[PDB]
Structures are given as C-alpha cells and as structure tokens.
C-alpha cells in the first residue's frame, strides 16, 4: 500500500507536527499548511531550500519584529498569512465620529488609546503634521516601533495572496518578480504595510501590488525603493485601495538612502484608489548629487525621466496633497481628486502632459497656496475645477478645456485657449441677460475689460431684447457702450467723445469718430480720410 499511497496522494506537511517552522520547512515537499498559531522571535529566519512550495495559512504568525523567509523557489505561493504583533501599542486617531479630521495637537493627543488598530503609532512626521504634538505626547506614546513583519528576502517569483493582520507589515527585500495579490485589508504597524526595497543588488523589477486593500499604518501603505520596471513597465500598483495611511497611500521614495539612490522608474500606477491619507494620496516624486542615479548635470532637480505609466486614479479626503509628483516628459491621464485639505495636485513637472484631470474641492483648509500647482512648462488638456465649496497656479503652462464655477481672478497660467470650438451659443438661466465677457489678465485679473450682452426689454415673453457692446474705462467695467434695440427702439445708440477729440484718438483710415462741441451744442466728427489725412467735419446741429 505504501508504494500506492505515495503515488496517489497530495504531499503536504502541517506545522502542528513540528516544534519549529524551520523543521516543517525542511520536511516540506509540495504543500505546507500553517494550522496552528506560531509565535516567532524577531529575526527568526526560515530556509526553504529552494523548494517551490504552496504555503496555505489557516492560523497566525505572532510576534513583534521580522519573520524572515528565504530561499523559496520560483513559483512559490503563500496564501492567507496573518501577521499580528505581541505588543498592543499606544495609537492616535486624528478624526472624529463624523469623520472630520482633527488638526489641533491637543485634540489629537486626547484620542490616545492602546489598540492594535483603528489608529496608528505617532512618528516624527506627526510632529510636522500636528504642530506642537511633540511636546504634548506622553513619553510612553513616543518613539514606538511595533510591527509584525513578514520579510521575503532575495527571492524571485514568489507571490503573497490574501494576506492580512494587525500591526502587520510585508517586506520584499532584494526581490524580483514578486507580487502582493488581493491583500485582505491588513491593519498596518509602524513600518510601511507593503514595501519593495531593492537598495542592494539589481534594481527591483517585476514587483507588483495587484488588487486588495490596506488600512491604517503609521507611514505609507505601499513603498517602492530602487525599482525600475524597464520599458515594459514591469512593476507597480494596479487595482489597489489604501485607507487612512499614516503618511501616503502610494509612495516612490526620493533621494539618497544610505549610499545609494532610492528612486523609481518605469512603474505603473493605475486603477487605484486612496482615501483619507494623513499626508498624500499618491507621492510619486523622485527628488527631494544623486549617487547611484543620474547626475544633476544630466538631469536637473525634479526633471528625471521617470516614465511611469499613470492612469485612472481616484483620491478622496487627504489631509495633505491628493496627487504629487515631479519629473520630465511625463504623460498623465484620468486623475480624479476630491475633498482634500491640502492641494489636490502638486506638480513639480516639466515638459509633461496632463489629460482629463478633475480637482474638486481641495485645499479646503488652506494648507497650501493653491488647489493645483505646476512648476514647469507643461500642457493641461481638460481640467475640471470646483465642486460645491489661487485655484490654479501653473505660471509656465498652457491650458485648454477648463470646466467648473471657477473664480477667474484665481487662475494663473501662461496661456489659456479654446482654439477648436464650433458655432457657439451662450445660454443664460435665472438672469435678465446673457453675456460673453472678455478679461485681459495683464490689465486686471479682477475686472472684465469688455463684453457682449443681450438684455431683456420689458419683461419675460416680450420677444424683445437689446444687444450691448461694452468697454472698461476708469477701472469701471462696461463704462462705455454701443447698444442695438434698447427699449425696442430698433436703432443703435452710439457713444461719442464727451469733449474735443484729439487727433490721436482716431485709429484707422476711412473711419470717423463723433465728438461733442459744447460751445455750439454740436456734434462734430474727426475723420481720417481714406488717404490718412485728418479733417474735422460738422456731424449734427440744432
């Protein structure tokens, strides 16, 4: 029977039969079932001998610190892992029962409680976010470092599916072609919830977070360090949801970490959602002189050719910035940012294109100077602004297609134009007139310089209106105007110079300019003959 049994049954060892995880690992051939809670010590390392294993977790890994998995064969899969710390730390919860953000340091300190979730351990970034909290926090709530972390080290082709936990962290160190798939809402600890760190060895490639969600955590939900997906854009975040990150939803590191670059190139950031981050929704910048990366002489600060594929992202409720990035030559599309306390978008980009961007009700707490900022020479095609609550400051950018109830005095761009509209109709509701106004921002950002109006004569249903063409004078809009059909008279009302017109008042040849001659109660006409010569004629008299 043994011979037969050995050939007809599926191989799997279960942790309940062994004293240590390494013993189980050593006996494993195909499957490995975690069927009993396992308390690990920080730094406990398991060597899987290069075996391609299917690890099914139906119990917890309990401990503060890292449980290190090494030498898993390509194709290995870990499903259902649950990390939980042994320590219950002190956490702050900077939001109310109505889900309003608390910004007052004293109000935030008052939320202190010991729990493994529904809040996070304060870190130094909180000292910046809630000014004065550093001195108000009790010493036992400061400098905590609790995280139960599953560290996969220097492996290739390993996938982690449906992972969860309390004060949990997942760290891929020196890995390639690894994926974090369908994370089952782990509640984060002190460190990043999902981190792909490749500071040593080759640049990380093939590393993805696909689907799923995370909640809480002291810092960013997803963090990438020194990853390059190549032209194939092999790596990134797709279909993910981050809720209440202590720092940002998704972050690509910036600057030098250690003696090398922590920057990232050629990654995808698509079809994802970030809600209620304490700092930013997406922090995709690379710069904050670049050891291990492009020298500043080749690419100036904030102008690296990051080349990320960015599309279809939604951000809501950030206490910080909704969407932030830097770089040159980028193409960004279909971004929707709603209800953020700081800027909806903070863009330190140059020679980049942004298509179909919607920034709705941001900078609601005046944390920044504007709702959307763009530093370099960029192009914006399709920009929706204002929901129900400067708006845009992109000094060097050319924009087209803004929609929304924006205050024109709060727009600052290099050039704004609608070059390809068809025949137009201006439809006016609730008013006695329709209008097409012109505003030269160089003259005034607050006053319209001229207008074409249509106004009702009499009342509704009169079938009569008068058209009025105006110009500003003495900083008084519509000060001077020509009318057609005022009071249904069917004639044109023409403005004349109130005094003797000077020779320089008339512009073109073959034109005349009426002027008043008070001393004779006469209307005169300064005429520039077709030959350019001026002559003054009598136009109207008693």
From Swiss-Prot:
Changing residue 247 to Q: Complete loss of hydrolysis of O-antigen oligosaccharides. The active site is at 247, 280, 283. One of its GO terms (biological process) is adhesion receptor-mediated virion attachment to host cell. It is found in: Virion. It comes from the Viruses. Keywords: Degradation of host cell envelope components during virus entry, Degradation of host lipopolysaccharides during virus entry, Glycosidase, Host-virus interaction, Hydrolase, Late protein, Viral attachment to host adhesion receptor, Viral attachment to host cell, Viral tail fiber protein, Viral tail protein, Virion, Virus entry into host cell. Structural component of the short non-contractile tail. The tail comprises six spikes that mediate primary attachment to the host cell lipopolysaccharides (LPS) and display endorhamnosidase enzymatic activity, hydrolyzing the alpha-1,3-O-glycosidic linkage between rhamnose and galactose of the O-antigen polysaccharide. Digestion of the LPS brings the capsid near the cell outer membrane. The interdigitation of the polypeptide chains at the C-termini is important to protrimer formation in the folding pathway and to thermostability of the mature protein. Belongs to the P22likevirus tail fiber protein family. Homotrimer. Interacts with the host O-antigen lipopolysaccharides; this interaction induces cleavage of host O-antigen. Interacts with tail hub protein gp10; this interaction anchors 6 fibers onto the tail hub hexamer. This is Tail spike protein. It comes from Salmonella phage P22 (Bacteriophage P22). The gene is 9. The chain holds residues 114 to 667 of 667 of the full protein.
């Amino acid at each position: 029977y043994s011979i037969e049994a050995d050939k007809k049954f599926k191989y799997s060892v279960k942790l309940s039969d062994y004293p240590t995880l390494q013993d189980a690992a050593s006996a494993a051939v195909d499957g490995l079932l975690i069927d009993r809670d396992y308390n690990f010590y920080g730094g406990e390392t398991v060597d899987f001998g290069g075996k391609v294993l299917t690890i099914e977790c139906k119990a917890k890994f309990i401990g503060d610190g890292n449980l290190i998995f090494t030498k898993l064969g390509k194709g290995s899969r870990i499903a259902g892992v649950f990390m939980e710390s042994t320590t219950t730390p002190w956490v702050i919860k900077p939001w109310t029962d109505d889900n309003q953000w608390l910004t007052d340091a004293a109000a935030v300190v008052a939320t202190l409680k010991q729990s493994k979730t529904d809040g996070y351990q304060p870190t130094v970034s909180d000292y910046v976010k809630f000014p004065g909290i550093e001195t108000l926090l009790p010493p036992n709530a400061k400098g905590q470092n609790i995280t139960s972390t599953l560290e996969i080290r220097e492996c290739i082709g390993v996938e982690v599916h449906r992972a969860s936990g309390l004060m949990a962290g997942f760290l891929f160190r020196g890995c390639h072609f690894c994926k974090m798939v369908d994370a089952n809402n782990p509640s984060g600890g002190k460190d990043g919830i999902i981190t792909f760190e490749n500071l040593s060895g080759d640049w990380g490639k093939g590393n993805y977070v696909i689907g799923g969600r995370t909640s809480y955590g002291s810092v960013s939900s997803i963090q990438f360090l020194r990853n390059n997906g190549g032209f194939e854009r092999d790596g990134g975040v797709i279909g993910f949801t981050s809720y209440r990150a202590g720092e940002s939803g998704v972050k690509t590191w910036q600057g030098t970490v250690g003696s090398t670059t922590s920057r990232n190139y050629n990654l995808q950031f698509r079809d994802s959602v970030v809600i209620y981050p304490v700092w930013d929704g997406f922090d995709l910048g690379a710069d904050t002189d670049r050891p291990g990366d492009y020298p500043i002489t080749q690419y100036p600060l904030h102008q690296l050719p990051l080349n990320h594929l960015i599309d279809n992202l939604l951000v809501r409720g950030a206490l910080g910035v909704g969407f932030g990035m830097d770089g040159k030559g980028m193409y960004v599309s279909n971004i929707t940012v709603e209800d953020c306390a700081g800027s909806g978008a903070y863009l330190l980009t140059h020679e980049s294109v942004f298509t179909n961007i919607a920034i709705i009700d941001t900078n609601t707490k005046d944390f920044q100077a504007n709702q959307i900022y763009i530093s370099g020479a960029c192009r914006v095609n399709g920009l929706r602004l204002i929901g129900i609550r400067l708006t845009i400051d992109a000094p060097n950018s050319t924009v087209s297609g803004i929609t929304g109830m924006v205050d024109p005095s709060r727009i600052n761009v290099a050039n704004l134009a609608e070059e390809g509209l068809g025949n137009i109709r201006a439809n006016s509701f609730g008013y006695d007139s329709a209008a097409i106004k012109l505003r030269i921002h160089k003259l005034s950002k607050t006053l319209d310089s001229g207008a074409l109006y249509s106004h009702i004569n009499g009342g509704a249903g009169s079938g009569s209106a008068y058209t009025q063409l105006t110009a500003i004078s003495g900083s008084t809009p519509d000060a001077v105007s020509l009318k057609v059909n005022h009071k249904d008279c069917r004639g044109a009302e023409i403005p004349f110079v109130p005094d003797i017109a000077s020779d320089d008042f008339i512009k073109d040849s073959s034109c005349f300019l009426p002027y008043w001659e008070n001393n004779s109660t006469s209307l005169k006409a300064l005429v520039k003959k077709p030959n350019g010569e001026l002559v003054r004629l009598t136009l109207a008299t008693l």
